[PDB]
Amino acid sequence: KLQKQLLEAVEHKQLRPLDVQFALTVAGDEHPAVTLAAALLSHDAGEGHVCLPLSRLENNEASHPLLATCVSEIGELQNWEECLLASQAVSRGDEPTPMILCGDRLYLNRMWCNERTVARFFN
Amino acid sequence: TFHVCHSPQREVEVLHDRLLAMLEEDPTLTPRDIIVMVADIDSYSPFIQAVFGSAPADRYLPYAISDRRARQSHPVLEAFISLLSLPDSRFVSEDVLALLDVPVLAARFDITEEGLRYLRQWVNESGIRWGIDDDNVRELELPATGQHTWRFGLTRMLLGYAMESAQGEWQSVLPYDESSGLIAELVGHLASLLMQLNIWRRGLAQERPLEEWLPVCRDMLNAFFLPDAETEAAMTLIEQQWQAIIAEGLGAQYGDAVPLSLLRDELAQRLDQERISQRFLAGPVNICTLMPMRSIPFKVVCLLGMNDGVYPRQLAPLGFDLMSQKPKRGDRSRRDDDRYLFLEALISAQQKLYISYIGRSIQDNSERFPSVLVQELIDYIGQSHYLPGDEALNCDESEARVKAHLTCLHTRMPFDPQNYQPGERQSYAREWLPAASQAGKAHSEFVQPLPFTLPETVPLETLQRFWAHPVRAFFQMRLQVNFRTEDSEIPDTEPFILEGLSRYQINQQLLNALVEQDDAERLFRRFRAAGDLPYGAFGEIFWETQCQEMQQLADRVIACRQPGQSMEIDLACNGVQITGWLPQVQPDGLLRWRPSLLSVAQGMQLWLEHLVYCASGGNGESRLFLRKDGEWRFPPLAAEQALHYLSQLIEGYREGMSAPLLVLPESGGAWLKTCYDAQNDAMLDDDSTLQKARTKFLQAYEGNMMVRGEGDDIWYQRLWRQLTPETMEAIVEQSQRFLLPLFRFNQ
Amino acid sequence: AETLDPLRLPLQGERLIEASAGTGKTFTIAALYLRLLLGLGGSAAFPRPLTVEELLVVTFTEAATAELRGRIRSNIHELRIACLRETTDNPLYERLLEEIDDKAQAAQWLLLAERQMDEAAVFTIHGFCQRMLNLNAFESGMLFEQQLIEDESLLRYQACADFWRRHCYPLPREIAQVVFETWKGPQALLRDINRYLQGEAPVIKAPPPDDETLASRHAQIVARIDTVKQQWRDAVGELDALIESSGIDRRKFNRSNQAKWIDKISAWAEEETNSYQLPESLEKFTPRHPLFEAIDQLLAEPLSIRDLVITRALAEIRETVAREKRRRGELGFDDMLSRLDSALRSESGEVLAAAIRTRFPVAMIDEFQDTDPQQYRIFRRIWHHQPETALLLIGDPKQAIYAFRGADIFTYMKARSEVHAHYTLDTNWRSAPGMVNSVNKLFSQTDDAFMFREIPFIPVKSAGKNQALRFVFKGETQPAMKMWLMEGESCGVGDYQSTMAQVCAAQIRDWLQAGQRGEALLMNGDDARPVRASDISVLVRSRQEAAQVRDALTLLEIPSVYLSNRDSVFETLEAQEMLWLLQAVMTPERENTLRSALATSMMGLNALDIETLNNDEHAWDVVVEEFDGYRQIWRKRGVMPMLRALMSARNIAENLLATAGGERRLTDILHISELLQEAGTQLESEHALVRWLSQHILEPDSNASSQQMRLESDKHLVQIVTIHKSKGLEYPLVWLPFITNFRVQEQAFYHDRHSFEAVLDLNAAPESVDLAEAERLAEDLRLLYVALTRSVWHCSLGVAPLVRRRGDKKGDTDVHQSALGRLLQKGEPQDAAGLRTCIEALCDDDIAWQTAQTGDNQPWQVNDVSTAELNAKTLQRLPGDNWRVTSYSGLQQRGHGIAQDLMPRLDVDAAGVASVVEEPTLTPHQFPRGASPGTFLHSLFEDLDFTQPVDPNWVREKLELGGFESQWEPVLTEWITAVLQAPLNETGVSLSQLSARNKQVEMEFYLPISEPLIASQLDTLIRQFDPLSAGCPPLEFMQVRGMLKGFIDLVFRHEGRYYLLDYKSNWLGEDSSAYTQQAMAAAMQAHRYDLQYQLYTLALHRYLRHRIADYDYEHHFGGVIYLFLRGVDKEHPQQGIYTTRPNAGLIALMDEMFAG
């Protein structure tokens, strides 16, 4: 699908081979929105910041022409919560999934476990 | 001259000294004027290269090998051929890492040895054994298991990067644990390379015409390799050969389609026909083979390898050729070509000559023979001259004397004193002089009395790790050296069975996780998602027989397993503060379990635990549940005996750190059960009974053909080769002295 | 069995020759070779004299081929000399010279044969079949180039793994449960099938039919068991059997046990209470029901899937291996033999047999006792008929001890039955007259002592020349053979070994000490000589007992040598030792693997040394530094210099020589170093070599190249040899300590006694076990015969009542199962008294006996001798000069290595790595970097038609054949026209106006220079006379002498006024402003191209002064024109071009500077 777009984005030197291979592996043959969300999640988790607002991932348009990228399904499915829950690889956090959405931000399962344990130890 | 020698190594080592002697003796001679004509350079290049690179600074003369096969950048060239052998591969991890080990291919993806050392143990422990994909499995007509593959390993690694390994399976794959930090970029580079390999092996499948075969070599080289300051010449040569063969095929007007396996095996054969001969007369000593139509006059001509069956080189006619049955004048053959090359080599020499060959085998000191040409030359030399000593004795006797005088049988080994004796055949080497003059000292004994003092705090875990195996703990504790073997190479097969060392380690882990009496189906599913058990029915059978054994054991475990507590020991014995924690301590006594066979080492660990418990409180029996009706038993004792025996064990520890304490508990346990009984409290003194006890001790030490013995071990092999009567008597007496603790303590 | 003389053998049809031990087999073969080469024999001769290349001899081993070649060549030379001189001294040569009539014609024939001998056929079976296949490839169906391979273990493992994954994964749980206890896995499957996977296919007795499926067999077993289960279900409810009191009263309990057992049939093994209702059980201690016989119908036949699965695996794995090897294109020895056999047996075999028979119309199959059925079938098919073609088989059946190699004796038996001619030899040229009589008395006791029919023992006689052989030990003479008898009633293997080794060592040292003083003399007639340490040589049959007798013999202070180990060097400790050392030196940064190598047993350290190395840090640092230096020496110059430097620095060679029992370790160390160097030269990396070493440690093969060399030969030592590799040798005195030990064969593999066909059985019938044990006893008898007959003057051996029964002693011994026991006790079991009296029966004037008693007196008297003092020679002057040949590589520095040697015409002056700069438009500035585009752009311009305009189709064809993308054509076709029309030097411009008569492309020159060129003296005149030499980085060269090399791109002329033209493609000048007269002038000094100016002008001037008479530099030269291919616009003058002219005096100075 968009693998050549991810490869030329890597050639433009803002995504890493680890990030693109991780996104490809964790998504398989999922939707373009889900693949780009996973790739940006991997990149922004690799830069250090745990926060990841949906508004930023829907309005950044930085690493790619993301408007034309996200126009790949019927219309423009702006309900990112529904399109993220629709994928089998993502749940709200009860199921053992790598992608966790808890505080209107999407971040990795390991960071979620670390934050939950440190919160329970704080209280 | 003629020089009968033993091995090619010794031939070249003799030739070096003879060349040096000639150069030193003649004041007007140049290394430009010396030639060495080996019969085949492929079998003599490594020895010549080794000795002429190992010649020291004050003894060095330059050299240059010519007429080799046309491969100098061997890693690049054979790596490229192996790249062209993609669609027939099976993709084992050792082969894939062998492609990584090439420095150019490693530096293309910007990964070094500091990452390669991580990826070795990553692919070893992640479970990556079989091919790349389910399509690759199915094209070999095998059941597509979908486990233990490259896709499986990469999915496991990335899932373990995303999620911790304690969260269980998500898509029937257990996540890995180590690849979590800032090191996953190496995994990403490996995954990108694997994706590139998959794309190119998908693209290399179908047949193409020549017009489509034109750019694939350049595309492959640019996509995979990386140009450097030296590899570009090899890349240009490869491109030239590929272009030449395909251009000739195109110009010959071929219209059909051809498979890849034809062009690959044609390029790999046209590569091995060219030669390199641009270092011939550069100035160093000229090393080259025997080539026709080249007769340059030199000063010293040396011929090596004149064995029977090696020269003249042979080549058979094709059979359906027609020029063989009807010869004429102009016909040319390899046999007479080499036979005339010998005459040209004899004529072209102007000052000296030097012919050498193997005359005696080095393996069994048998007899060998020279070539017919050398035999005829020696015969004519003997029949044309006579020594001045015997002016008129006999023709045949004079011939024998001359042929014995000319031949010089060299020695068999470098450090023979005949080489360094003063005379004519003296050597120029000096590194073998003290080894040939017998001016060395013999080896000492490894074990020595080392002064060790006892600190004021030894932890309980250190004592347990010492008394698990005293000799091995002395090796890897006092002087910190272990004889760790080579790392286990990644097997080419999935785990079919569980036997031997695999049984020990893996089954120990599996049973020790299986003990805990919780739900077994979830644990079985987790271990099969981890990819360890065999495929399907065999794994189910193995799990079922382990379950029906371990439930039987757990029945008698739970039949008296009252849940206890875990306490902490602090105590002062001999001015030493022994500290440690206690697992499975209860008011009832000592009831333990370890899923293995019955052993006096296990009983002695339980004994130590019982003594430290009795030293700090501790009333109750000592049991430790084992397989095959496992049982240990002794009533609790008093604090006087507890402290006395604890002090005795601490003294034994402080002696075993200083000196290699000989304790072999299991064989000592067998001799304990044989000699000392619970009914007599005195050892037997009859010769037959003591020899029977010795028989039980020696069968416990070394086993029969069926089972392996305790004494067969790397540590005991390091201590001594064999068991002489003196040292086995010493072992029995040292048992009777220092194992006498265990002799009294365990009955 | 007639008397044989080589001068009267009829050479027609098929023959058979049996030569006794020590008779001259190689001598008889050479005599027959000479007789056939001359065509002699009268009425019993061949019709015509043959030649050298038409006498096929299939000799067993390569050393034997070499010895046979040497002996034949020497015999031919001596016969030719004797025929020329007409007199000789050798009796056979005298007889041959009397037989020959035409001496001159015989001399001519022998001269031609001796000259033709460098291609003689004294070959082996594999070297014969390989060439016959490669010759008649049309008839045999083979390729014309085959790469040989010998690693088939991995192929067998992969085949078995594929079989396991193919026919054990789809099976369900209730059948996997059955196969699981039958065998655990593919490891056990290979361990059971490996001995039968290779060679001739064994004929399976009673095979299942091909229509049977494993599930069908399971269903058949299930049906057969619930039939009797249903019969028991019918029969329960009555007690009609015979009531007895002497049995157990719980028979009703057994009936109720079976009745409650009938619930499920999922099990495969039946209960233990069914063994007391069978007719055997009723007759050992009343029919009344048919279940009485139904249970016997069940129990009379075993149940197993073993035979079926073994048959399927044995029929599948071999074909899978053959198919994979055929697909990948390899070949092997067994494969070649099988392919020749199949091609000769098949329909195309007639023309192949005709061709082979008309190529080699004679054959002498040497060593016929070691013969395979395939080879016998080939020989029978080729030479069984078609007269005036002969065949002479030669072999000794009594020495066939190579059963484990793959040979067979029953094929020889069938050949002996088929052949109607028999000949044998009688004399013995080696052994003693008492020894031959002792052996005759020992072996002529019973009838058919070799327990077969077609192997008749016959007596032999010694020669009349050796009638004075004797042996005196302190006065009186000694008997030939003398058994030594243990005193006792029962014995064990360990005590047997210990006491026999100690007695043997005591007698050996007694012999040596009594012979060192000239008292124990090996007298031959009236001559005399003392014994030494070389004559005594014991004969052991196994490595463990060899080591044990070595320890005993060095405990009595005698040095010893071990000769004939079959295993490789890689299984000893030195292999793992160097594996650890190499693993440490590859990565010396790790303290664990550095200390694990520092503590290794050949470094020779102690615990104090390890402690003082561990605590200190500076010593650790310098150890790491020296190991890093060793790694650097490895990475530059291979393995062997690194190990040599390590040994010379760490004193290991002297330490292992001063330590006793270490010279063997040193020899093994040198062998492993040589093998590692040989492998690492042909390999590509270092970790590949490490993996190669580790894999060869894991697989210790037993090939013909990786065997153990003998450790030393400077001092004569007693030779502990192995029986198998002692076949053919000779020792004066021997010892046989362990001759009364045997092994019991267990597996089922027996040959049929009617058709001599090998039969494999998969059942536990005792007939198969007995038939295998009989062959084992025959093999042990033949091995005993060999070990007895190797001796010459004396042969001692030790007999003891060995008993290995679990019970201690009952009176009867199992020594009759031994090869010596079966002969001494005449086949019937006896006691110790019977053994002693049957030994004493044969004590008659040549055989003696004694009771072995241990006597310890003293170790030895070594008689230490020191000889002299020695020194190494010295070198007193400089080794070599500094002659060289350079091709403009003094100035361009190193890094450009063997690239010039690989590709001479390579664009060396272009280098760099490319990237992605893909602007959508295409421009000549965007042509990719590297050396291949440079040597494409330079290769474009030599062959053109400059006057005529360029054709676009030619440009497209060049770009398509060059492996480049074909869209570059419109850009290149205008770039060529742009660069071909430049205004160079105001005349001769616009190169299209140059004809073919005025050009000369790719010149090559040579400038001999004497008086070694100082780098400063060259620059000290260059810098003055040139303004571009402001930037001065000189002395980039060194002292060089010799020739010079270089390529001129193109030289033309225009009414005189010659020129030098140069194309230079370079870095990505993406803007045209980066190729101006200032940027190029800066790059000229930055790349030091200014030397090419003076060098090329001097080279062309020295050629013009030789070619053109009356040559003037100012009137004829003109200068040098440089261009730059990238950056030539359409109409932009003096851009990308560069013109320069020399100073006309610098050349005149530098010419005589170079040449004097």
Swiss-Prot record, chain A:
Any GO molecular function: 5'-3' DNA helicase activity
Key words, A-Z: ATP-binding, DNA damage, DNA repair, DNA-binding, Exonuclease, Helicase, Hydrolase, Isomerase, Nuclease, Nucleotide-binding
Assembly information from the UniProt record: Heterotrimer of RecB, RecC and RecD. All subunits contribute to DNA-binding. (Microbial infection) Lambda virus GamS protein interacts with the enzyme without displacing any of the subunits.
UniProt lineage: Bacteria, Pseudomonadati, Pseudomonadota, Gammaproteobacteria, Enterobacterales
Protein role: A helicase/nuclease that prepares dsDNA breaks (DSB) for recombinational DNA repair. Binds to DSBs and unwinds DNA via a rapid (>1 kb/second) and highly processive (>30 kb) ATP-dependent bidirectional helicase. Unwinds dsDNA until it encounters a Chi (crossover hotspot instigator, 5'-GCTGGTGG-3') sequence from the 3' direction. Cuts ssDNA a few nucleotides 3' to Chi site, by nicking one strand or switching the strand degraded (depending on the reaction conditions). The properties and activities of the enzyme are changed at Chi.
GO annotation (BP), single: DNA recombination
Domains (record comment): The holoenzyme may undergo conformational shifts upon DNA binding: the nuclease domain of RecB may swing away from the DNA exit tunnel in RecC. When Chi DNA binds to the RecC tunnel the nuclease domain may then swing back to its original position (that seen in crystal structures), allowing it to nick the DNA 3' of the Chi site and then rotate to load RecA. At high Mg(2+) the nuclease domain may swing back more frequently, explaining differences seen in assays performed at high Mg(2+).
Protein's name according to its UniProt entry: RecBCD enzyme subunit RecD
GO cellular component, as recorded: exodeoxyribonuclease V complex
Protein family: Belongs to the RecD family.
Domain of life according to the entry: Bacteria
UniProtKB/Swiss-Prot annotation, chain B:
Molecular function as annotated in GO: ATP binding; DNA binding; DNA helicase activity; exodeoxyribonuclease V activity
GO annotation terms (biological process): clearance of foreign intracellular DNA; DNA recombination; double-strand break repair via homologous recombination; recombinational repair; response to radiation
UniProt entry keywords in alphabetical sequence: ATP-binding, DNA damage, DNA repair, DNA-binding, Exonuclease, Helicase, Hydrolase, Nuclease, Nucleotide-binding
Activity regulation description: After reacting with DNA bearing a Chi site the holoenzyme is disassembled and loses exonuclease activity, DNA unwinding and Chi-directed DNA cleavage; RecB remains complexed with ssDNA, which may prevent holoenzyme reassembly. High levels of Mg(2+) (13 mM MgCl(2+)) or incubation with DNase allow holoenzyme reassembly, suggesting it is DNA bound to RecB that prevents reassembly.
UniProt KW Zinc keyword: no
Disruption phenotype: Decreased degradation of DNA with free ends that is unable to undergo homologous recombination, which can fortuitously lead to more efficient viral infection. Cells are deficient in DNA recombination repair and have increased sensitivity to UV light. The cultures have many inviable cells. Cells can be transformed with retron Ec48-containing plasmids.
GO cellular component entries: exodeoxyribonuclease V complex
Superkingdom of this protein's organism: Bacteria
This protein's record includes keyword DNA repair: yes
Record-stated family: Belongs to the RecC family.
Domain-level remarks: The holoenzyme may undergo conformational shifts upon DNA binding: the nuclease domain of RecB may swing away from the DNA exit tunnel in RecC. When Chi DNA binds to the RecC tunnel, the nuclease domain may then swing back to its original position (that seen in crystal structures), allowing it to nick the DNA 3' of the Chi site and then rotate to load RecA. At high Mg(2+) the nuclease domain may swing back more frequently, explaining differences seen in assays performed at high Mg(2+).
Residue window of the full protein shown: 375 to 1121 of 1122
From Swiss-Prot, chain C:
CDD domains: RecB_C-like, SF1_C_UvrD
Keyword Transcription: no
Region Nuclease activity, interacts with RecD and RecA, annotated ranges: 882-1156
Keyword Phosphoprotein: no
Activity: how regulated: After reacting with DNA bearing a Chi site the holoenzyme is disassembled and loses exonuclease activity, DNA unwinding and Chi-directed DNA cleavage; RecB remains complexed with ssDNA, which may prevent holoenzyme reassembly. High levels of Mg(2+) (13 mM MgCl(2+)) or incubation with DNase allows holoenzyme reassembly, suggesting it is DNA bound to RecB that prevents reassembly.
GO molecular function: 3'-5' DNA helicase activity; ATP binding; ATP hydrolysis activity; ATP-dependent activity, acting on DNA; DNA binding; DNA endonuclease activity; DNA helicase activity; DNA translocase activity
Quaternary organization: Heterotrimer of RecB, RecC and RecD. All subunits contribute to DNA-binding. The C-terminus interacts with RecA. Interacts with YgbT (Cas1). (Microbial infection) Lambda virus GamS protein interacts with the enzyme without displacing any of the subunits.
HAMAP family registered for this protein in UniProt: RecB
Stated name of the protein: RecBCD enzyme subunit RecB
